[PDB]
Amino acid sequence: AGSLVVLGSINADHILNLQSFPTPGETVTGNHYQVAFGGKGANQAVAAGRSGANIAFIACTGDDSIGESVRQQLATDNIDITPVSVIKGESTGVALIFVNGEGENVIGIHAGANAALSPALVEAQRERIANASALLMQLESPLESVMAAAKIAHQNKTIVALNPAPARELPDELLALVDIITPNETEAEKLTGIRVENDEDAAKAAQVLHEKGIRTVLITLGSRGVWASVNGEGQRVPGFRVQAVDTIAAGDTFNGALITALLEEKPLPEAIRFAHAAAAIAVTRKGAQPSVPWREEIDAFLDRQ
Amino acid sequence: AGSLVVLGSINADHILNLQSFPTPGETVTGNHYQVAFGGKGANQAVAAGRSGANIAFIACTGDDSIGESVRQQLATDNIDITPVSVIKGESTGVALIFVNGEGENVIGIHAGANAALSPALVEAQRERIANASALLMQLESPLESVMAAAKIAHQNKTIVALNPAPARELPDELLALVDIITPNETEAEKLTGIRVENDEDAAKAAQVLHEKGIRTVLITLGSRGVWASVNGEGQRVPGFRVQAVDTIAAGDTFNGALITALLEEKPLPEAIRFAHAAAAIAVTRKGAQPSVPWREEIDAFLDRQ
């Protein structure tokens, strides 16, 4: 298994379950509270580490207590935290989350130290990025840093995997550097300009990304699975049926487990089944990282399948 | 100045300024983040301590890091934290707060350790409550504990001051034990059944509370000040004109400073002017406790007045 380098955000998730979302000017008392480490960068770094990858993590926390704790935690999640910088005078990223009695949620985010992951910091990681087999990134880090990291990778035979979340348009210069992209429907549309409701739309949107030069395109479709497309040839790959309790980080787990499988040189079809198994498990648990399953659990799930 | 005993909640306030309140299923990135110690019990305990009172604080924090920090903090706010218990296996109370670009806010609360402040814990404080000159309470603690604390006070010549917030109806058994009550309009209506929009309504609502046996009734009216009523005789007392930046804890500061003034045996009219000065200062600053002014600042404000 080649080495993986994840570059992305780190958040401390504060989750409060409550009857209903407070209206403007209102105060509501919740029924359950949970602090769990989150952030797409870390969720994916953890999903990969736990699933068995040889991964190093480029990220930034602040100089606060919470920052030290998450750092303490990630180190035990089978992740090399040597590339995680501490930014003096800044707060560690945070996410305030409400979940109502109807199962819906709303999230408020503070970028904090995450906005400090600069091109200068990426350059300082030139060698690490150069020697890795693949680089996994999202969009909760400055675009200029993601851009600069992708170039170094493109220059040194480092596979570039991008989870284009949260949704936003991207320059062709960055897309022309991506090898594996994993957008959901909203993101696929935002990236191609094509609304994706059905498999016909997904194939069309996929085609647009392929023309940008992206070899592998996986569009998460929600309940019906993912549209897996390699160089124009795609098909819908169903996920597992499970009773969801908390879907947060489901997509991040999918991404982290997927890359682990691919860097293990498993064929795409099996890799996707592996990532789907991991995600299926993740939605049956609460909190982002606390729900990310380890390799043993993933394989056990598969074996009983 | 006689001794003051505050019994109430302790919260860690997580405040995020953002463009607009996220809609169901949405994620929004904020522009400013602040962690400040809050909770009506602590806000009032701090407002009193800083304003110069000889105050001891009965409360509960969890056995987490945040709990230790707030405890470390309150000790420097001129408060005797000897009566603050640590509850094993429980989280310190928390408040998740959003403030949009229009200045509005919504608050989500986790009771945490605060729900553990029991009658047994109050009884353990029988002597402390007995020897104090006054007891200041709110409604973010179990009603049975507030009830039991009020009885001990009633039995030992301890003045009972109640800030009936958040709004909720209360049994006549508790009201018949209150000496000073400080409801806002919503709370006054909730307590008497009389809608309070104007000074005529306020006087009527005040009358209802007086009949419950409460000698001093102060109904905060919002912009026009407070309806100060002693045994049926009331009048509107205007507050100071100021440009508000953050009104949270304004009412708690008013309460804490007010009691300090009264326990200093200042006449009600002056006591109310003192509390108003403190609150006026509080709304020009961000965060709950971080905005509570110290005695020197309050007197300076008054002198320049």
Pairing of strands B134-137, B3-7: parallel
For residue B225, give both structure tokens.
Answer: 């000040």
Structural domains counted in chain A: 1
The answer, for A147 touching chain B at a CB cutoff of 8 Å, is no
Q: Contact, A219 vs A255, CB < 8 A?
A: no
Alpha-carbon Rg for chain B, nearest whole angstrom, is: 18
CA distances from B242 to B49, B51, B103, B223, B249 (A): 24, 20, 16, 10, 15
Helix count and strand count (H, E) for chain A: 11, 14
Q: Which residues of A are annotated as a binding site for K(+)?
A: 246, 248, 282, 285, 287, 291
Q: Which helix (H) or strand (E) holds A119?
A: helix A119-123
Distance CA B285, CA B12 (A): 17
Distance CA A254, CA A165 (A): 13
- Tell me the backbone φ, ψ of residue A270, rounded to 5 degrees: -75, -35
Q: Contact, B96 vs B108, CB < 8 A?
A: yes
For residue B27, give both structure tokens.
Answer: 């994620």
Q: Contact, B127 vs B100, CB < 8 A?
A: no
Q: Chain B residues with CB inside 8 Å of A35's CB?
A: 91
- A275-288 burial: b if 16+ Cβ within 10 Å, else e: bbbbbbbbbeebbb
Distance CA A98, CA A104 (A): 8
Helix, strand, coil share of chain B (percent; to 5)? 40, 25, 35
| DSSP letter assigned to residue A264 | T
Tell me the residues of chain A between 220 and 249 that have a Cβ less than 8 Å away from chain B.
none
Closest CA in chain B for residue A110: B30
For residue A172, give both structure tokens.
Answer: 């062709």
Distance CA B108, CA A18 (A): 8
Q: Contact, B1 vs B32, CB < 8 A?
A: no
Q: Which of B49, B117, B48, B35 is nearest to B84 (CA)?
A: B117
The answer, for B300 touching chain A at a CB cutoff of 8 Å, is no
Q: Is B282 annotated as a binding residue?
A: yes
Q: Which helix (H) or strand (E) holds B181?
A: strand B180-181
The answer, for A89 touching chain B at a CB cutoff of 8 Å, is no
**Cβ <8 Å between A33 and B107:** no
- Cβ neighbors of A140 (< 8 A, separation 6 or more) are A8, A9, A39, A40, A41, A111, A114, A165, A166
- Please tell me which of the candidates B27, B105, B112 has its beta carbon nearest to residue A109: B27
- Measured in angstroms, the resolution is 2.3
Helix count and strand count (H, E) for chain B: 11, 14
Alpha-carbon Rg for chain A, nearest whole angstrom, is: 18
Considering Cα of B41, then B44, then B48, then B51, what sign does the dihedral take? positive
Q: CATH number, domain at A88?
A: 3.40.1190.20
Q: Count CA atoms within 13 Å of residue A196 on its CB side.
A: 27
Q: Is B222 annotated as a binding residue?
A: yes
- Please tell me which of the candidates A21, A106, A108 has its beta carbon nearest to residue B30: A108
- Cβ neighbors of B245 (< 8 A, separation 6 or more) are B283, B284, B285, B286
| DSSP letter assigned to residue A184 | B
CA distances from A85 to A5, A9, A50, A116 (A): 15, 12, 21, 10
Distance CA A50, CA A142 (A): 26
For residue B118, give both structure tokens.
Answer: 């029991």
Residue B49: CB atoms within 10 Å: 29
CA distances from A255 to A151, A161, A225, B251 (A): 21, 9, 14, 48
Q: Contact, B116 vs B91, CB < 8 A?
A: no
- Please tell me which of the candidates A30, A106, A108 has its beta carbon nearest to residue B109: A30
For residue A20, give both structure tokens.
Answer: 């209903």
Closest CA in chain A for residue B247: A25
End-to-end Cα distance, chain B: 25
Q: Count CA atoms within 13 Å of residue A133 on its CB side.
A: 14
Task: Report the amino acid identity of residue B288.
Answer: A
- Cβ neighbors of A198 (< 8 A, separation 6 or more) are none
E-assigned strand segments in B82-169: 84-87, 93-99, 105-110, 134-137, 159-162
Omega before B166 cis (within 30°)? yes
| Residue B102 burial by Cβ neighbours in a 10 Å radius (0-12, 13-18, 19+) | exposed
Pairing of strands A93-99, A105-110: antiparallel
Q: Count CA atoms within 13 Å of residue A58 on its CB side.
A: 30
The answer, for A176 touching chain B at a CB cutoff of 8 Å, is no
For residue B240, give both structure tokens.
Answer: 């100071």
Q: Contact, A96 vs A153, CB < 8 A?
A: no
Distance from CA of A100 to the nearest CA of B (A): 9
Q: Which of B148, B145, B139, B141 is nearest to B182 (CA)?
A: B139
| Residue A171 burial by Cβ neighbours in a 10 Å radius (0-12, 13-18, 19+) | exposed
Resolved by: X-ray
Q: Dihedral through CA A178, CA A181, CA A185, CA A186, nearest 10?
A: -50
**Full residue range of the structural domain in which residue B132 is found:** 1-305
